[PDB]
Amino acid sequence: TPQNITDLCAEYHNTQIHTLNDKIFSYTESLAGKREMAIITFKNGATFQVEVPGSQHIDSQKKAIERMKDTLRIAYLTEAKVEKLCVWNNKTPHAIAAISMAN
Amino acid sequence: TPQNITDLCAEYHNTQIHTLNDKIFSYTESLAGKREMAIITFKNGATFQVEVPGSQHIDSQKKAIERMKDTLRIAYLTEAKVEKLCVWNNKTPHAIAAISMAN
Amino acid sequence: TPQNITDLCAEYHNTQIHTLNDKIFSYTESLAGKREMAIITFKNGATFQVEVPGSQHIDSQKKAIERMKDTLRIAYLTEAKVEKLCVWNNKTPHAIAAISMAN
Amino acid sequence: TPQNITDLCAEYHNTQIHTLNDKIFSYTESLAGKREMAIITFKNGATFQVEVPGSQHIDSQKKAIERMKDTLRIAYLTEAKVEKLCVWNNKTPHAIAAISMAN
Amino acid sequence: TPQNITDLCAEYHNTQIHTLNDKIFSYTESLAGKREMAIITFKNGATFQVEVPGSQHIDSQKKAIERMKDTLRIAYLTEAKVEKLCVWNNKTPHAIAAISMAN
Numbered sequence: 332t333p334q335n336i337t338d339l340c341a342e343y344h345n346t347q348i349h350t351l352n353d354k355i356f357s358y359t360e361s362l363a364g365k366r367e368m369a370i371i372t373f374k375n376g377a378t379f380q381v382e383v384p385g386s387q388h389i390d391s392q393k394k395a396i397e398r399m400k401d402t403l404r405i406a407y408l409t410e411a412k413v414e415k416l417c418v419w420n421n422k423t424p425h426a427i428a429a430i431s432m433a434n
Numbered sequence: 435t436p437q438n439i440t441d442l443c444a445e446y447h448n449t450q451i452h453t454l455n456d457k458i459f460s461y462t463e464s465l466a467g468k469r470e471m472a473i474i475t476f477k478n479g480a481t482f483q484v485e486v487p488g489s490q491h492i493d494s495q496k497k498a499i500e501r502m503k504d505t506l507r508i509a510y511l512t513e514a515k516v517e518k519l520c521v522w523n524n525k526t527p528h529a530i531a532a533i534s535m536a537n
Numbered sequence: 538t539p540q541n542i543t544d545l546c547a548e549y550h551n552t553q554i555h556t557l558n559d560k561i562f563s564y565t566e567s568l569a570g571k572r573e574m575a576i577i578t579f580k581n582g583a584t585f586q587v588e589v590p591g592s593q594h595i596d597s598q599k600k601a602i603e604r605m606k607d608t609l610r611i612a613y614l615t616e617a618k619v620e621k622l623c624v625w626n627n628k629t630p631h632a633i634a635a636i637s638m639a640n
Numbered sequence: 641t642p643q644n645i646t647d648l649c650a651e652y653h654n655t656q657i658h659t660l661n662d663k664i665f666s667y668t669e670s671l672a673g674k675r676e677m678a679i680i681t682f683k684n685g686a687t688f689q690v691e692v693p694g695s696q697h698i699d700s701q702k703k704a705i706e707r708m709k710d711t712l713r714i715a716y717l718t719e720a721k722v723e724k725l726c727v728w729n730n731k732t733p734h735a736i737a738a739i740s741m742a743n
Numbered sequence: 744t745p746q747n748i749t750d751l752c753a754e755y756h757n758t759q760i761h762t763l764n765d766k767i768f769s770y771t772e773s774l775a776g777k778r779e780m781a782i783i784t785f786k787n788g789a790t791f792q793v794e795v796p797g798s799q800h801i802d803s804q805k806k807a808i809e810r811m812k813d814t815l816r817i818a819y820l821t822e823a824k825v826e827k828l829c830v831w832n833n834k835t836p837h838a839i840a841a842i843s844m845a846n
């Protein structure tokens with residue numbers, strides 16, 4: 332198994348690492364039908380989503396999607412610094428695959 | 435895809451954005467039958483609900499409704515500033531579709 | 538839908554509003570069989586329960602009962618002021634139907 | 641229903657009350673197979689478990705066991721004073737049936 | 744039934760204790776398919792995983808794996824000192840079986 336987010340991210344196509352080293356600037360979540368998602372931004376303007384669950388996800392990812400939204404909310408509220416995001420860059424906004432927090 | 439709450443809200447009929455830029459003033463929740471819901475108010479008197487789950491909601495919204503109540507409770511308790519609410523205005527109190535939090 | 542806890546409470550028989558405007562003084566929870574419940578008290582001694590789930594509860598209430606115990610625990614630990622409780626007064630301790638929190 | 645943890649405890653065989661009036665000194669939790677459990681200790685050395693779910697438990701206790709582990713973890717992390725534990729004393733470590741917190 | 748993490752760890756093949764007595768330095772979590780996992784590190788470089796749920800795990804462990812990831816996230820965010828980890832050291836990074844928090 333990978334030992335860090337960069338190596339994990341590299342195991343997938345259409346991904347990249349974004350380095351933020353900053354707290355989340357805004358947290359948005361929706362219960363509207365077909366847009367059951369979260370969106371975060373950083374003060375540099377960078378915007379990321381947790382995608383709506385769909386046919387692109389395998390069953391094992393469903394619980395992890397819900398956990399990621401839990402993690403973003405509590406990171407936002409505690410002002411935790413986000414080190415890196417692994418995202419899929421074939422989506423707009425880029426779609427989060429993994430998060431690392433440090434400092 | 436939408437990149438913010440205003441753009442998301444616009445995708446739906448019978449919605450509008452309320453701009454609060456304030457912490458929640460009160461948080462109410464109920465387990466009484468057929469009123470399993472949350473109500474929030476702001477100091478300006480504005481009152482909003484998370485609707486009781488019902489036939490107006492598709493399955494994917496049910497988990498998101500539960501998450502929204504989780505979010506309002508911890509936003510309340512942490513005195514997190516609510517930036518905007520996307521609501522359906524064909525309900526009384528206006529029914530929350532989405533929330534954004536920012537500093 | 539109700540604008541506030543008082544109007545919600547009034548929709549049910551055997552209910553009353555208790556106005557506390559105080560933090561919870563003690564929190565008790567049990568996993569013992571047939572007593573899977575929570576009990577809270579206030580400084581003046583007044584005691585309230587979240588009832589064990591049972592045949593008086595409709596299915597939609599089961600999730601809301603679990604949420605209420607979550608809410609009471611974090612309210613307790615954060616010393617959040619409880620404004621009002623809506624309770625069923627045909628049970629001893631009075632059984633919580635809804636809670637409002639406000640500063 | 642009982643008004644307090646001492647009366648609750650008295651409804652069961654093989655139980656006793658421990659009065660700690662202290663924060664939890666250590667929190668341990670395990671995902672190891674057949675030992676999916678929590679263990680807490682106090683400064684004086686007293687040790688308690690949340691038992692692995694088992695055939696001695698009825699279905700209504702399953703959710704309550706998971707909630708108890710949630711409660712112990714957050715009590716530990718917040719240094720919340722534990723007033724009393726109701727335990728089964730026919731297990732080693734004694735098995736938690738109920739907890740009360742009062743500052 | 745064990746009284747502490749060391750004795751629990753010793754009930755399993757291919758385990759060891761790590762004594763850290765330090766807060767978590769970084770927290771990583773992923774929703775990427777087949778890598779639905781968490782990774783933590785300490786300032787001395789020690790790296791640990793919560794494994795992806797899989798054929799090595801029995802049913803009873805599934806909730807406990809989810810709980811473990813919850814615990815590591817909140818330990819990280821609260822800067823809780825980790826005393827010891829019980830791990831399987833037949834995996835790279837070593838795989839967490841249990842955690843103790845103290846002091």
Ligand SMILES: O=C(NCCN1CCOCC1)c1cc(O[C@H]2O[C@H](CO)[C@H](O)[C@H](O)[C@H]2O)cc([N+](=O)[O-])c1
Pocket residue numbers: 362363364365446448485490491492495522524525529
């Ligand atoms: O949130 C919605 N999501 C879209 C997803 N689904 C596709 C079509 O079948 C059902 C909904 C959605 C909300 C709609 O609105 C209705 O439901 C809302 C809660 O979901 C609110 O209760 C609102 O007051 C009500 O009018 C109406 C429609 N619509 O009339 O198509 C879609």
Ligand SMILES: O=C(NCCN1CCOCC1)c1cc(O[C@H]2O[C@H](CO)[C@H](O)[C@H](O)[C@H]2O)cc([N+](=O)[O-])c1
Pocket residue numbers: 465466467468549551588593594595598625626627628632
């Ligand atoms: O919260 C309730 N709303 C809807 C649930 N209903 C419960 C009974 O089966 C029918 C549906 C509700 C509460 C009712 O009250 C009953 O259940 C309560 C918990 O729900 C309390 O336990 C209360 O002490 C008890 O009398 C009675 C009715 N009723 O007689 O219609 C409705």
Ligand SMILES: O=C(NCCN1CCOCC1)c1cc(O[C@H]2O[C@H](CO)[C@H](O)[C@H](O)[C@H]2O)cc([N+](=O)[O-])c1
Pocket residue numbers: 569570571651652653654691696697698701728730731735
């Ligand atoms: O034999 C039991 N029930 C029937 C006896 N009566 C039940 C009502 O109280 C008074 C005595 C009985 C045994 C119980 O205890 C058993 O299960 C416990 C976990 O639930 C502990 O594991 C305990 O170590 C174990 O002996 C517990 C309960 N319970 O939590 O309801 C009932």
Ligand SMILES: O=C(NCCN1CCOCC1)c1cc(O[C@H]2O[C@H](CO)[C@H](O)[C@H](O)[C@H]2O)cc([N+](=O)[O-])c1
Pocket residue numbers: 672673674754755756757794799800801804831833834838
């Ligand atoms: O955690 C296990 N629980 C099963 C029950 N307990 C097993 C040990 O004796 C006490 C009872 C268990 C773990 C085992 O170990 C395996 O799974 C671990 C995760 O569970 C790790 O993935 C570890 O790297 C791996 O070797 C192997 C077996 N097995 O081959 O049956 C059981």
Ligand SMILES: O=C(NCCN1CCOCC1)c1cc(O[C@H]2O[C@H](CO)[C@H](O)[C@H](O)[C@H]2O)cc([N+](=O)[O-])c1
Pocket residue numbers: 343345382387388389392419421422426774775776777
């Ligand atoms: O995260 C992946 N995990 C590996 C499991 N795979 C899931 C899809 O079915 C194939 C097996 C995975 C991600 C993939 O990426 C796809 O899904 C992502 C969400 O999971 C994002 O939505 C991304 O935008 C999309 O391209 C594509 C594949 N793929 O083409 O195999 C695998």
